[PDB]
Amino acid sequence: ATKAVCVLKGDGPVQGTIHFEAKGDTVVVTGSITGLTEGDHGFHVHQFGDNTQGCTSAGPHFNPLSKKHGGPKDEERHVGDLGNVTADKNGVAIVDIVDPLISLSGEYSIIGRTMVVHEKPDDLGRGGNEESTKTGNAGSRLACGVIGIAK
Amino acid sequence: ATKAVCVLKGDGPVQGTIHFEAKGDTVVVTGSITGLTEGDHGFHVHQFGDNTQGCTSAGPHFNPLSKKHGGPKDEERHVGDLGNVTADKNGVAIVDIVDPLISLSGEYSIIGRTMVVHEKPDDLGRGGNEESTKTGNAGSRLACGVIGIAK
Amino acid sequence: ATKAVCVLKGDGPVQGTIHFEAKGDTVVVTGSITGLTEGDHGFHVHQFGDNTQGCTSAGPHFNPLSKKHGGPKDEERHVGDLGNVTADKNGVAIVDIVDPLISLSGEYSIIGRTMVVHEKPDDLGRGGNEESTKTGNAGSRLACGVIGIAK
Amino acid sequence: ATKAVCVLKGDGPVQGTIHFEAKGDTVVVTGSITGLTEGDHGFHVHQFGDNTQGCTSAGPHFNPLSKKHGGPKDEERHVGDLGNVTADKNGVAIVDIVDPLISLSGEYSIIGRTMVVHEKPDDLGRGGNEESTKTGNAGSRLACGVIGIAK
Numbered sequence A, B, C, D: 001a002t003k004a005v006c007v008l009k010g011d012g013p014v015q016g017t018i019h020f021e022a023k024g025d026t027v028v029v030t031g032s033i034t035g036l037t038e039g040d041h042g043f044h045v046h047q048f049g050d051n052t053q054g055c056t057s058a059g060p061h062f063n064p065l066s067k068k069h070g071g072p073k074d075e076e077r078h079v080g081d082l083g084n085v086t087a088d089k090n091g092v093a094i095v096d097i098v099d100p101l102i103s104l105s106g107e108y109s110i111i112g113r114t115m116v117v118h119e120k121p122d123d124l125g126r127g128g129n130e131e132s133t134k135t136g137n138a139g140s141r142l143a144c145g146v147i148g149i150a151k
């Protein structure tokens, strides 16, 4: 697959759609998310496309290299670490990410996994506590969806 | 990926969880669907893991061998042709399928695609109209979900 | 039966010949209707090949899947829902339909049933009254005939 | 179908309605025909439900076993060979035939074919000439109709 899609849904008003496209050795991640409080929100690929108990059953960050949490620009990061998306005053975030580590095929493929938008900003591993090194202190899972093959 | 899961949701009361497991050289499909009308309902892997327009955006049946619609025992069938699930009088269908065409990795992978439960029985491609050769006259898509990697 | 024919007759000037042919996996509908008013007229397979009370005794639309009335492109439609034919200013309609639900043998066969051309356009089940969900508000039956096996 | 109907019409005053009902391995043929000259009239299922050029376009006797013409009681007969109906002095014939060879379903089905009442008596193949072995010398087609599925 060179194209993928994710519909983000949660138990509150947060929703959106994310598009994924293979370009060179990168994945180009675009889309939009509504209903968010203004400011940054952690945005991560979680390990499992399991929504049986909601976003919680997606498990931790997709992490096949067994590293600690960081920002997308960091060497020490989880594959699923895409940093922050930014909502404006209207609650809307436009997603425009280009990432070399995630993939839509092969070993680091995110097809069949879960995209999650978080309650709080991702501190990118620089928070000075244990949690920062795990989730970036991004807190609760506002909305999520399984990543699917798109036409 | 040796285990997958799917959570089925639609516009109506129909819901359920489908489990997939790679066992030996085959794929075992289990789970249950509730809120169905008594009797048979088409049960198919649709091509796209795309829920942007609910179940409609899943596209046609997964069909990488470019065949006509059939039953799961037929040579001429789509890879996604898993026949019928059967609901009892309480609207409950127990899912128990072993299938030789689907997989959980490589060309035949259904990870990132869509499981659909239909309004009507699948006629296994033997209805005698053109629709039968496409969908088995299974009709509308009551509920669907993207197939995700499971723990 | 791979070819069928229908001769349309009514109480007024409306007449025509409709040809049906099983081609590939589908049914191609051709022919022409004359004596019509300019514009659209509902064109439907009615259930009974019964002309004992003219076109009235043909009964409702052929509907073996127990659905509501729609257009021929719709999922929710009767098997007999072939939409509209269009008459030009001289009252002539050229019939050119390919249809996935009708057949010329087996469950979906329209052989021995009735082709009806209606007074008014078919609203494709979107008119918003109850009648729309039955007949598309197509109104009276200008002309009809029993579908017969052709050489 | 277990029930069928035919409205007989022609270019003259002969008309009637014929009813067909599946009973055991027979079809029970009933109805009435008016406007006839007193005496016997050949009564046959013709091959095609094609009325585009009137009764003539119905073609020959329905004959899927490729036999010669006889009476309904004869081994050598066409499937469409139902013998004679008898008009009284008032021009009225009451039809009451029970036949094992015609069918309303499967290979010998007469649904979509044509019922014809003839000018002259059917000589039942015993006329001593070539025509007798083809049509029973029943002569012209007074009235006919396509056989349709009835409620």
Ligand SMILES: [Cu+2]
Pocket: A042, A043, A044, A045, A046, A061, A116, A118, A135, A138
């Ligand atoms: Cu996260």
Ligand SMILES: [Cu+2]
Pocket: B042, B043, B044, B045, B046, B061, B116, B118, B135, B138
């Ligand atoms: Cu399907």
Ligand SMILES: [Cu+2]
Pocket: C042, C043, C044, C045, C046, C061, C116, C118, C135, C138
């Ligand atoms: Cu109609």
Ligand SMILES: [Cu+2]
Pocket: D042, D043, D044, D045, D046, D061, D116, D118, D135, D138
């Ligand atoms: Cu004859």
Ligand SMILES: [Zn+2]
Pocket: A044, A061, A068, A069, A070, A077, A078, A080, A081, A134, A135, A136
């Ligand atoms: Zn992380």
Ligand SMILES: [Zn+2]
Pocket: B044, B061, B068, B069, B070, B078, B080, B081, B134, B135, B136
């Ligand atoms: Zn199929």
Ligand SMILES: [Zn+2]
Pocket: C044, C061, C068, C069, C070, C078, C080, C081, C134, C135, C136
């Ligand atoms: Zn209709």
Ligand SMILES: [Zn+2]
Pocket: D044, D061, D068, D069, D070, D077, D078, D080, D081, D134, D135, D136
């Ligand atoms: Zn004969």
